[PDB]
């Protein structure tokens, strides 16, 4: 098919429109699933007090005799003016960073802080439900397709929940968003390997991850300019309504229809894009996890591979979706994130070249696993150093997904590549899900997350050392 490929042109004007809109799409997806950081931050919160709130002493002194003094707590009241009791009248909201949020919205807060984590997993889960019914999907029907059905999903999802009026409902609809996301990503990949010559699958690739570096700068911008996480969703979201006028523009991958056999339209589609050859030429021109598993040698090496993806999966998850507690300022912290993996990245795609691909992948997980025990260790005072150190282990990390991704795909041959990049993603996915569930350990102390989070990436580093190259 390669020939077809340079006979269309492979890499040209059609190619570079095709990967910025498909860069743009990302972005904005990027920003979908980083939304939530801003859409749920948790603010200052205490008791509803009936003296502080009526229902001369200065205010301070008030929330002094009100509220009792905490790790002034953040759940807990006097029964009567300086004993304490719960929240028996709701609470009060720190409003100065975030107009609304939806923990100041469905309270969830101590007795129900784990919904605040627990609904970012919903999230994360549907994603990974989503490659598992989008990946046949995709195979079946176009892939153009389901990309254009996955935009439309996400922006009608994305609007639901901007507009939920109760908590489980905002999390059965970021389940659904998650659930189209998946088919984005996975049909926007495709559809970039699929229309681009060989030799520049990895260039490709490292544009796609340049997609969520840029779409993080654009996550703190548009939380920067809306405050409401109602506004913020939905700002968020309306951006595929969009994505899904333009997708019918995408041409459809050309070896999906030559493969499963409509040649005709499968002749028009590749026509069109090099027009941006006759029937008789694209005639003559145009591995299950089981074997992957059995056979014996490629255990260690699919072992290890499964693992960085799962560690990649569950730092990057458990990090980025919590930099409150990485940081002070969120929105510095969200913009350092892609600010700081663009030239990661690059570096990562440079070092798999000259300094190998085994070092280079063993050496950005175990800086992102240092950097974030060191995170954790340094002083909570220093705030500046935590944070630009957090910022260093999410690029970290990121260059580590980079290197595996274009790793993963020498380490099996031709045949069963294509199954061992599915179990790593999937494995991936699973990292992700499990990533804001450790979040919970922090009432043992906020020390113990950042720690989950600094030993598996180094651990998985560690183990990458023992990889054929
Ligand atoms: C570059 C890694 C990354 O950065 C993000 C920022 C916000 C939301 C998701 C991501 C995200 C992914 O999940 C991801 C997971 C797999 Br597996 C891929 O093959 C690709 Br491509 C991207």
């Not at 153009?144 to 109760?166: D, E, H, I, K, N």
């Not at 591995?287 to 059995?294: D, N």
């Not at 000259?354 to 954790?376: D, H, V, Y």
Request: proline letters at 6%.
């Amino acid at each position: 098919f390669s020939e077809l490929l340079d006979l269309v042109g492979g890499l040209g004007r059609f190619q570079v429109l095709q990967t910025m809109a498909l860069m743009v799409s990302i972005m904005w997806l990027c920003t979908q699933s980083m939304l939530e950081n801003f859409s749920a931050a948790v603010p200052s919160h205490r008791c509803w007090a009936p003296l502080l709130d009526n229902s001369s002493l200065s205010p301070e002194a008030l929330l002094a005799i009100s509220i009792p003094p905490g790790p002034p707590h953040q759940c807990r009241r006097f029964r009567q003016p300086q004993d304490t009791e719960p929240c028996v009248d709701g609470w009060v909201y720190d409003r100065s960073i975030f107009t609304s949020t939806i923990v100041a919205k469905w309270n969830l807060v101590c007795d129900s802080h784990a919904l605040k984590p627990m609904a970012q997993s919903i999230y994360l889960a549907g994603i990974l439900v989503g490659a598992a019914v989008c990946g046949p999907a995709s195979d079946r029907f176009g892939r153009r397709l389901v990309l254009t059905w996955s935009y439309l999903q996400m922006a009608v999802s994305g609007t639901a929940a901007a507009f939920a009026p109760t908590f489980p409902v905002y999390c059965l609809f970021r389940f659904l968003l998650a659930f189209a996301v998946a088919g984005v990503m996975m049909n926007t990949g495709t559809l970039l390997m699929e229309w681009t010559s060989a030799r520049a699958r990895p260039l490709v690739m490292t544009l796609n991850s340049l997609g969520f570096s840029f779409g993080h700068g654009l996550t703190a911008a548009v939380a920067y300019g809306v405050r409401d996480w109602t506004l913020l969703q939905l700002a968020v979201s309306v951006p595929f309504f969009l994505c899904f006028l333009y997708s019918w523009w995408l041409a459809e991958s050309a070896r999906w229809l030559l493969t499963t056999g409509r040649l005709d339209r499968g002749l028009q589609e590749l026509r069109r894009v090099a027009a941006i050859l006759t029937p008789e030429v694209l005639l003559s021109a145009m591995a299950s996890l089981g074997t992957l598993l059995r056979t014996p040698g490629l255990r260690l090496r699919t072992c290890i591979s499964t693992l960085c993806w799962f560690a990649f999966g569950f730092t990057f998850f458990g990090l980025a979706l919590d930099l409150q507690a990485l940081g002070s300022n969120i929105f510095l912290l969200q913009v350092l994130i892609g600010v700081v993996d663009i030239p990661a990245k690059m570096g990562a795609l440079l070092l798999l070249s000259r300094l190998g691909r085994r070092p280079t992948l063993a050496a950005s997980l175990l800086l992102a696993g240092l950097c974030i025990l060191a995170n954790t260790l340094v002083p909570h005072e220093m705030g500046a150093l935590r944070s630009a150190l957090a910022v260093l282990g999410l690029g970290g990390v990121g260059a580590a997904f980079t290197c595996i991704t274009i790793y993963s795909s020498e380490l099996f041959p031709t045949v069963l590549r294509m199954t061992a990049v599915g179990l790593g993603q999937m494995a991936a996915r699973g990292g992700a899900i499990l990533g804001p569930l450790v979040r919970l350990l922090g009432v043992h102390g906020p020390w113990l997350p950042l720690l989950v989070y600094g030993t598996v990436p180094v651990l998985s580093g560690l183990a990458a050392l023992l990889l054929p190259e």
